[PDB]
Ligand binder design. Sequence first.
Ligand code: CLA
Ligand code: CLA
Ligand code: CLA
Ligand code: CLA
Ligand code: CLA
Ligand code: BCR
Ligand code: PQN
Ligand code: SF4
Ligand code: SF4
Lengths: 61, 31, 739, 80, 141, 29, 96, 107, 30
Amino acid sequence: VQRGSKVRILRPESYWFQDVGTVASVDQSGIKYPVIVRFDKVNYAGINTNNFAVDELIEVE
Amino acid sequence: ASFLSSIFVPVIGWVVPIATFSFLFLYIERE
Amino acid sequence: ATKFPKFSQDLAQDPTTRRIWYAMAMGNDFESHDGMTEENLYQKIFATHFGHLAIIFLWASSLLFHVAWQGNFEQWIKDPLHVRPIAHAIWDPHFGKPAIEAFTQAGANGPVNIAYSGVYHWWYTIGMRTNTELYTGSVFLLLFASLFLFAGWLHLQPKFRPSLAWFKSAESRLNHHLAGLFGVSSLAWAGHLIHVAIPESRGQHVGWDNFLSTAPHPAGLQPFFTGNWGVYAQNPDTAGHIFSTSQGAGTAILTFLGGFHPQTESLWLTDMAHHHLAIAVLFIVAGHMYRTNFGIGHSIKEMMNAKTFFGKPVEGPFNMPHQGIYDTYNNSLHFQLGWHLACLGVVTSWVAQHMYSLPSYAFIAKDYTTQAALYTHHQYIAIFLMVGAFAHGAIFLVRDYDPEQNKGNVLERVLQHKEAIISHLSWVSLFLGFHTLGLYVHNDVVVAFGTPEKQILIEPVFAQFIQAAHGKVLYGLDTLLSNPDSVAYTAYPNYANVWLPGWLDAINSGTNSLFLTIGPGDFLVHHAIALGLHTTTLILVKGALDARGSKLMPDKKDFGYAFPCDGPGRGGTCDISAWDSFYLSLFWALNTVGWVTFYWHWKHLGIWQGNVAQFNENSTYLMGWFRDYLWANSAQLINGYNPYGVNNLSVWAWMFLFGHLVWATGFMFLISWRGYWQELIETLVWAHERTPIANLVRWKDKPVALSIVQARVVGLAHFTVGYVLTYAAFLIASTAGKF
Amino acid sequence: SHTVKIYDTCIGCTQCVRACPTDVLEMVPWDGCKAAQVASSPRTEDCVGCKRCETACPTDFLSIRVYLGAETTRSMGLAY
Amino acid sequence: LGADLTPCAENPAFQALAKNARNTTADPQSGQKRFERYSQALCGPEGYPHLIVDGRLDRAGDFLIPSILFLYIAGWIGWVGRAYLQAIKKDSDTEQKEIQLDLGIALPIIATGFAWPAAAVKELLSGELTAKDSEITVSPR
Amino acid sequence: PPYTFRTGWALLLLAVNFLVAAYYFHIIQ
Amino acid sequence: TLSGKTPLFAGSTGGLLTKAVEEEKYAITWTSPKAQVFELPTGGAATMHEGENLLYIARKEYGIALGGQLRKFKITNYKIYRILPSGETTFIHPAD
Amino acid sequence: LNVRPSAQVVWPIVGQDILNGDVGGGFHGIQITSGLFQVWRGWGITNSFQLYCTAIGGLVLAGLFLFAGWFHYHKRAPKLEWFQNVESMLNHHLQVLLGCGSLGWAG
Amino acid sequence: SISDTQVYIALVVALIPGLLAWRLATELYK
Ligand code: CLA
Ligand code: CLA
Ligand code: CLA
Ligand code: CLA
Ligand code: CLA
Ligand SMILES: CC1=C(/C=C/C(C)=C/C=C/C(C)=C/C=C/C=C(C)/C=C/C=C(C)/C=C/C2=C(C)CCCC2(C)C)C(C)(C)CCC1
Ligand SMILES: CC1=C(C/C=C(\C)CCC[C@H](C)CCC[C@H](C)CCCC(C)C)C(=O)c2ccccc2C1=O
Ligand code: SF4
Ligand code: SF4
């Protein structure tokens, strides 16, 4: 979307499923999951960022 | 005929496992 | 590169000793064999089920033969209240001469084992009187077990081998098994009681020679067809009936007194005869319900997929979506096996709950150790059948479950709100444990400080009522069959309470285990049992529902049912699999049945000794359990052998120590894990190739340490065997040393 | 041996190749991701099931996965 | 009555325990004043007070009175701890305030919440007590 | 919606909970 | 062939085993700038030579665990072979 | 031979005054097993006042250790080579601590 | 107890399931 837009996650295998993220950067051509979403809470690995597809997200702002 | 205990119990105690284990050891180690 | 195991090429190409151990624990797993198709699966399980069935009859025939040939059954008929039964005889070469004199007992020539399984009481009840009937029934079961060993061989031959559609015809099993296996066999046993066992109960021999000549009733089947069925309930066995004699006998064959025989303190054999006759009619009628090839009856697949209640559209039966459950039960074998173990696990404990309070065998209420063993036996059997119900239910969700066929139904809706099930199960486990342990420790400190009146003692006033709503005058609640003015007491329109004068005599006597008197010591232990049932269920349900993946590890279905972990990553995943939640629960299941059988055993040690005040004072605080039951009763046991001599309890004194050792050995497989031991075996592999004479020989299979899932099996095996053998040596000898 | 599946979600971080101690993994060029390379496992007969490669991967959930299979001599880690 | 419950003032077993009273505190008659209050309970055959958790208003001091006194306190422990976690979620750090207590925010939460039954119904009837199930993370089924 | 079918059976079962307590409180005999 | 020098250590009990006669055996070669002390994955300390070295190891896991230890010596030239008992030497590290 | 070694008189609050049992000598308390009465007689302590000035003297000596831990870290901290004088450490610690400590105690 | 003769009948009859158990356990494969 744009740098600062709160989105939601619908990927079931992901840790932040049905949680609110924050888009940090969106790429242009490749990867198929070009959206960097800087989350606010960490997973079990300790990280808080991930890549997602364009249709994967639900904009809430 | 209580003497059959003297001939079934040592066979099951000794002869039955010796015949079983020596069959199974040669069967599991068989190419 | 060997050809063993035959059922797996991936295991047979294993150079290590893992090849040997995984053959054993995958051998009877028919579904994971190489090339096993669907119809070949059922045809192999069906013939295997003839193999386990014929072990049971060969087992039960050795009970008959070792009693007829080595026991004292005919000497036990003369006085069952003091003559002590005999199971089998000992031929042990390792005995010393004071250990032949100690086991020469019960009036025998050689060393004999006192039978504590109560099979003399069951055979004496059902008519058997001499050692020849025991031998005749033994030889019959040799032929009857070989009739199933031949049947399993016959139904594996190619044109005698049943097709796939024969197995998945579920409406035809329910008609034949309910009407025939349940109903006719209950009808046949009612025929055995009336023709044989009830006349044998009156000093009147009826055998195979003269049962066609003699009639069970002098009326003789004329009042059956004419409808004058009240002739069968004429003059019963009176209250002075001495068992297996003609004193105080009767002519009735179907009677409905209710309560107990006045001498044997068992149920009347005429009550059991009208019971299994009435059960038989209710089941043959139940077996004419489902649709078979005769175009009539209910159809289960139409009962599930129905959506219309008298014109009103609904979601299904009870307005609940049960569609696809017929294709879920019947297509899967782990859904069936996981289901029927829960059904058999409920009834197994339900057998044990009704056999100490309602004894049905002659002179079994006064032979104490045979009764203390039969409760604890079928309770532990009911434990494994319930843990395996959730275990094989969770193999279903990993392997057999299909969410598309099961979409939208009631089994899909459980998997949606599964975090609400586990949360409220986690609540009750903590809500009970924080407040049940709190009240024992409260009572422990309060008694220790010399002021025991500050105990928190609660009368069980909600189970006080039920025993008084069943007819116990002892509490004075005065309701519902203890209120003689009640509508339930009188049965107001018809007055047909035939059972009730005989029931109220049994429940109001203090000489039986029928609805025992309960107090504040029994309040805390039933809430301690409820701690153990909701917590064991917590582990099993959470392992069943999270078996297909979760947040820490998705796609757990891709790894099967038993896998060790997923590494040290993500904080580590030790004991993550659905098998591992089977594993944790059998510590609780053995624990909870400890609590239900420590409490069973110590309440009856006050009844059997006449000291009810020892339990009611001391079972409120946890020292009285520890002192007056564990410490005080193990004095007869541990002195089974001492430096002064031996006695007949020295096996149980040896097995008690043996159980403490198998139990403690199983900790080694659980505290210490694998990677310590693979680095130890690699030093023994070194120092065998270097020793100069002993390296002439060498292994064929490379020695490796036991795998991670394997020594959780082997660790739980030493734990469970030692848990059983320790208590079973304490249960017997603390009761059979005191009587 | 074991089975190393690599999904299409990784970013070419080269943390999994620099962590597998039997050197099963290697990078091949692939026009998808930003770093334009994907991990590949052409030598899975050498994999010992260590799951160091799953520990080092950033992406949630893991682009690399080790399925534990039949255990030969090279995957048991036996020097004998 | 009750049952198997005579009153403690009628039992010879309770009065036998009365003659050998052990003093709880250094009060020299604390053993004696203990038993004049236990005389109104129901002591069984042993001489020990058996409580009645039924709901009978003549035995309300056993369980009816301490249940109301408990549930006011323990819900207020959890109501204050709920209102503080709502406050510090909308701050810059949000994890410093969890281990290292923002005492200027915590003390207005503690002193306020004693009327939590007047409070906790208002979040219930307005639906602010719970969260939407489309906004909570769930496991793959 | 007002859940008629859920609350219909919960009030039936709770009426059984209150009926047995009426025997225990001697309201009905 | 391989043609490398053998490092300076008094022998270990780790070393090579019967597998080196029977199933397979690996070998890692590296060309060292100087002589210094490193560690054996078999166990203990050793001393590399100057120029081409050679260490017959038991498994492939040893040579890549050693090659990470050689990386902090500015030695990124290590090549592991797979020496079969039929004499078949297979270049396995690197891929090219 | 008859009086049992006892300290730790228990506050009487919740009935835990029953832990103050009669040890002998008109005294109620917990019978200790640590053997400090054998040590104090082995030191030669006769009355209570010698135990007070020892204990008050210990509280002063506990304050010098706690002050020097502040001083030798936050104020005047040694360098590295002061620590690696293990020949100089063993000479002071074997002579002054152990030897002179047991010579003074021999006195 | 039972006679000494009747024990040998029980042993010979027990070979009939002993033979049939060997046939079933080998028809179920190796
Ligand atoms: C599974 C049932 C079973 C069991 C556990 C026992 C147990 C015993 N029997 Mg007995 N027995 C049985 C059935 C059984 N009996 C039957 C049906 C017969 C009639 C043929 C006999 C005839 C018999 C005699 C004549 C004698 C014993 C003796 C003994 C004792 C020593 C063991 C021995 O020598 O075996 C003896 C075994 C046989 C003679 C043949 C075994 C017959 C059964 C049917 C085989 C069952 C095999 C089993 C199902 C295979 C499954 C293995 C399992 C681990 C998977 C021991 C108390 C001896 C004794 O009392 O010593 C004091 C003795 O002298 N038994
Ligand atoms: C009327 C005909 C009839 C009868 C008698 C049976 C009988 C049986 N079938 Mg069956 N079957 C039938 C028709 C019939 N079937 C038809 C028509 C089909 C095809 C549609 C099938 C398909 C089928 C399959 C596929 C299988 C069976 C199996 C079985 C066996 C069940 C296991 C067992 O022995 O439990 C015996 C159970 C009882 C006697 C009742 C127990 C009741 C509860 C549990 C206990 C009550 C006892 C009570 C408390 C007192 C006990 C105390 C006393 C012991 C001291 C049993 C022999 C299974 C088997 O083992 O194969 C051999 C099996 O796999 N059947
Ligand atoms: C009639 C009931 C029934 C049936 C048909 C099955 C059938 C099956 N189960 Mg199941 N199960 C049952 C009851 C049943 N189980 C119960 C009651 C439990 C709970 C304890 C379980 C728990 C369970 C688990 C957790 C698993 C199975 C699995 C399996 C499958 C393979 C079994 C196997 O590999 O055997 C191999 C047999 C063994 C390894 C036997 C070793 C254990 C023995 C009994 C220890 C005995 C100790 C020793 C002899 C005592 C000596 C005493 C002496 C020292 C004094 C098979 C479909 C496995 C599977 O993968 O399913 C597909 C699996 O993971 N079951
Ligand atoms: C006198 C001594 C005593 C002690 C030391 C405890 C100690 C404890 N109780 Mg307990 N309790 C007691 C008496 C006592 N109880 C009595 C007399 C009753 C009867 C009214 C209860 C009823 C009770 C309940 C119903 C619960 C506890 C719980 C707890 C634990 C946490 C309590 C808490 O404040 O958590 C801090 C508080 C929170 C984290 C949140 C507030 C949760 C409270 C306790 C529930 C109130 C919500 C609501 C108003 C009522 C819910 C419906 C309920 C009627 C079913 C704790 C170990 C809780 C527990 O076991 O959790 C696992 C729990 O749920 N107790
Ligand atoms: C803010 C405090 C708080 C509140 C309101 C709740 C509320 C709840 N918890 Mg929870 N919980 C908490 C803290 C809290 N929890 C903490 C700190 C722990 C770790 C020990 C847990 C562990 C826990 C478990 C294991 C379970 C719950 C459950 C529950 C639910 C039922 C009530 C219950 O069983 O109490 C449970 C209470 C305890 C286990 C102990 C209470 C913890 C302390 C004593 C109270 C916390 C007070 C807090 C620190 C004060 C901060 C004040 C602030 C101004 C600084 C409910 C949603 C249960 C559930 O899911 O039911 C559906 C359940 O199974 N919780
Ligand atoms: C118990 C106690 C205490 C006390 C202590 C004290 C009391 C101490 C003292 C101390 C002391 C009191 C010490 C002493 C020492 C001494 C010495 C150490 C000496 C030495 C000397 C010398 C060395 C000499 C020599 C010489 C000579 C002889 C001659 C020639 C010269 C010369 C000089 C060399 C306190 C408080 C801590 C507390 C705790 C407990
Ligand atoms: C002792 C032990 C070993 C070493 C033990 C081994 C390798 C086997 C030891 C037993 C030997 C093989 C003799 C077995 C004899 C048994 C007493 C009976 C065997 C008969 C049955 C197999 C039929 C492990 O490898 C291990 C791995 C992971 C967790 C725990 C452990 C663990 O506890
Ligand atoms: S699998 Fe992991 S390590 Fe490999 S390229 Fe993808 S993200 Fe990087
Ligand atoms: S199995 Fe895992 S840890 Fe081992 S080499 Fe392969 S990816 Fe790396």
